[PDB]
């Protein structure tokens, strides 16, 4: 990160690797949460 | 350790936070100290060579002046004795208008001299009687020193030469120009009868060029803007109204009631026709400019522009009266076409711009008129305020000269003569009041001493030379400012004069304040709130 600040306090930025990691983790968690309710023998 | 509990009686019955001072050691010797310190505070702003002083009040406003009354007003004093001295100075300013520092110097000197008499043994009453006797003798002596009385108060050069000194004591270098300006302004408005109102001189300040670009104008200027399309008139007949320039209504609540449609279709047309008729009736008399003190309406403005009427709105409730005095008109409390007696006449009425300021000018060619205005140009508001105060002192001096025509020499000559004669008188009085009389005589050297100290010379040599030259019979010899060696100069030839009435009132008020301070014995103060 540059020594100069280009954001207000509390503002955040995520670049390539971290952004991809966060997006993939969130999507996979959402899918895994609802996988269990699929098919004739799904549960509630 | 142990404690000293209290004294029985009043010391125990006193409230918490109150103060009780009694005796010579706890009241008189502290009041003298307070008054002496107050006098020392403003001693350095006395004379032509006085230095300016910068004061910031409790609202973070900035003052730069060497006027004693303004300095004392802007300072805040917590000590009652200094408060009484301040009120004495303010009363002197109200009564005459110049001499507010002489009072402080004289009172401080008198008190600091009475202190040593009290120390060596005399009581307060013997000091008071001696001071009163000496003051009466001084008032008796004073007239004999009158010289060079005023001759003509309608001659420009003589008025300038008489007013030069009181301005030179504050603006060293610009005194000639300021005296010329103020002399013109004062001679312009001086009637046949002796009555000279101070309020009839107006001062207007415009930021811009230097002081040398100031001017005087025979009429009135307002920092306003013309409300109409017309901007200039070359021979103006003026109408003045105190009511708003609009169709009037009832004082009681009113309501337009309609039961048909013809009334609804005709109301606004009738109102517009009525307003047009009124405006044209006003315009038919020949009025070029209408001055109003209140609100103007859009329809009225439209018709005034239609009939080529200049419309000016000024609003102070006092500027309207001053304009009426200036032009010769009478304010009308109802909107009616004026009669000739109610109609004012002014030569030129126009809108101009000076140094990023839009002004409206009513101007005459007459050298007398009724009032006049002084337009000041400076590079700083503080400088303009100081010049305004100098102009005020000049006007007050002119009014005092109107009241009384007698002058006395200045620059220490009068004080030295009074001190010498009072000492000679007090030499022959047997009793214990001779010490008080001699101290009263000695207190007069404080003025030439302060002048010499401010000038930057040795005061002892100046005083000794003044005494030596006065012993030969020269009553018009005083301190010389221009020389770098302590010297003396004839004041009558140099034109350094000052009014008799101012000296009279200053001596009277200073003596009264000093004896009033001396009369107090014990003080009871409640806790501040």
């Amino acid at each position: 990160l540059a020594p100069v600040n280009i954001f207000k306090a509390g503002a955040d930025e995520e670049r390539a690797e971290t952004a991809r990691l966060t997006s993939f983790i969130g999507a996979i968690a959402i899918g895994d949460l609802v996988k269990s309710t699929l098919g004739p023998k799904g549960m509630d | 350790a142990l404690h000293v509990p209290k004294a029985p009686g009043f010391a125990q019955m006193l409230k918490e936070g109150a103060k009780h001072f009694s005796g010579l050691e706890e009241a008189v010797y502290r009041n003298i100290q307070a008054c002496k310190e107050l006098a020392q505070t403003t001693r350095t702003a006395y004379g032509p060579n006085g230095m300016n002083k910068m004061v910031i009040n409790h609202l973070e406003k900035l003052f730069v002046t060497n006027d004693a009354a303004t300095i004392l007003r802007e300072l805040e004093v917590q000590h009652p004795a200094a408060k009484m001295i301040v009120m004495a100075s303010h009363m002197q300013e109200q009564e005459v208008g110049d001499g507010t520092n002489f009072v402080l110097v004289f009172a401080g000197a008198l008190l600091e001299l009475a202190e040593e008499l009290l120390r060596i043994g005399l009581s307060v009453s013997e000091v008071i009687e001696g001071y009163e006797i000496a003051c009466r003798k001084a008032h008796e002596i004073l007239p004999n020193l009158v010289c060079c009385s005023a001759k003509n108060l309608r001659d420009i050069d003589e008025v300038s030469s008489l007013l030069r000194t009181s301005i030179m004591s504050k603006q060293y270098g610009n005194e000639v120009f300021l005296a010329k300006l103020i002399a013109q302004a004062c001679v312009s408005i001086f009637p046949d009868s002796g009555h000279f109102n101070v309020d009839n001189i107006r001062v207007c300040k415009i930021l811009g060029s230097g002081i040398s670009s100031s001017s005087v104008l025979h009429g009135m200027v307002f920092k306003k803007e013309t409300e109409g399309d017309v901007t200039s008139v070359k021979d103006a007949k003026i109408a003045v109204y105190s009511c708003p320039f609009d169709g009037m209504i009832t004082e009681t609540k009113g309501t337009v009631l309609i039961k048909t449609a013809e009334e609804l279709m005709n109301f606004s047309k009738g109102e517009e026709n009525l307003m047009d008729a009124q405006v044209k009736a006003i315009a038919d008399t020949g009025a070029n400019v209408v001055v109003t003190g209140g609100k103007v309406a859009d329809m009225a403005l439209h018709y005034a522009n239609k009939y080529n009427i200049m419309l000016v709105r000024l609003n102070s409730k006092w500027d309207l009266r001053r304009l009426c005095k200036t032009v010769g008109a009478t304010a009308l409390p109802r909107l009616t076409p004026p009669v000739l007696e109610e109609m004012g006449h002014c030569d030129s009425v126009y809108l101009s711009e000076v140094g990023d300021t839009q002004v409206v000018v009513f101007k005459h060619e007459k050298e007398d008129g009724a009032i006049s205005t002084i337009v000041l140009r400076g590079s700083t508001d503080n400088l303009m305020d100081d010049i305004e105060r100098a102009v005020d002192d000049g006007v007050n001096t002119f009014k005092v000269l109107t009241r009384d025509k007698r002058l006395v020499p200045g620059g220490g000559a009068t004080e030295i003569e009074l001190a010498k004669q009072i000492t000679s008188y007090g030499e022959t009085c047997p009793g214990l009041e001779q010490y008080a009389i001699k101290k009263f005589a000695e207190a007069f050297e404080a003025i030439p001493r302060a002048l010499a100290e401010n000038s930057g010379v040795k005061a002892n040599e100046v005083i000794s030379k003044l005494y030596a030259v006065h012993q030969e019979g020269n009553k018009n010899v005083g301190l010389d400012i221009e020389a770098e060696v302590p010297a003396v100069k004839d004041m009558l030839e140099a034109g350094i004069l000052d009014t008799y009435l101012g000296k009279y009132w200053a001596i009277k008020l200073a003596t009264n304040a000093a004896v009033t301070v001396l009369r107090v014995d014990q003080i009871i103060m409640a806790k501040p709130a």
Partner: protein
């Protein structure tokens, strides 16, 4: 005369200043940071940015003007670049 600390400017002890070439270098660094952030969204093969609002709303966009408008910055040079982009738009 002892020219002790004398007060000239209101709130003198809590304001800062920057002069000389240091200010110019700081400006250049801020401009470089903004340009380097905006570099990767150029061309038919460029990628896009995901911006989260103050209230949690999501915007996936490739428009430089909208990105710079939705970013919140303190640097005056950064604000100048934002205004430049908006004027072009």
């Amino acid at each position: 005369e002892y020219g002790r600390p004398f007060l000239i400017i209101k709130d003198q002890d809590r304001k800062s200043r920057l002069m000389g070439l240091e200010a110019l270098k700081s400006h250049i660094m801020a401009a470089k940071a903004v340009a380097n952030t905006m570099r990767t969204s150029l061309g038919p093969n460029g990628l896009d940015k995901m911006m989260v609002d103050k209230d949690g709303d999501v915007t996936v966009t490739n428009d430089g003007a909208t990105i710079l408008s939705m970013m919140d910055v303190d640097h005056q040079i950064a604000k100048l670049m934002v205004e430049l982009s908006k004027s072009q738009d």
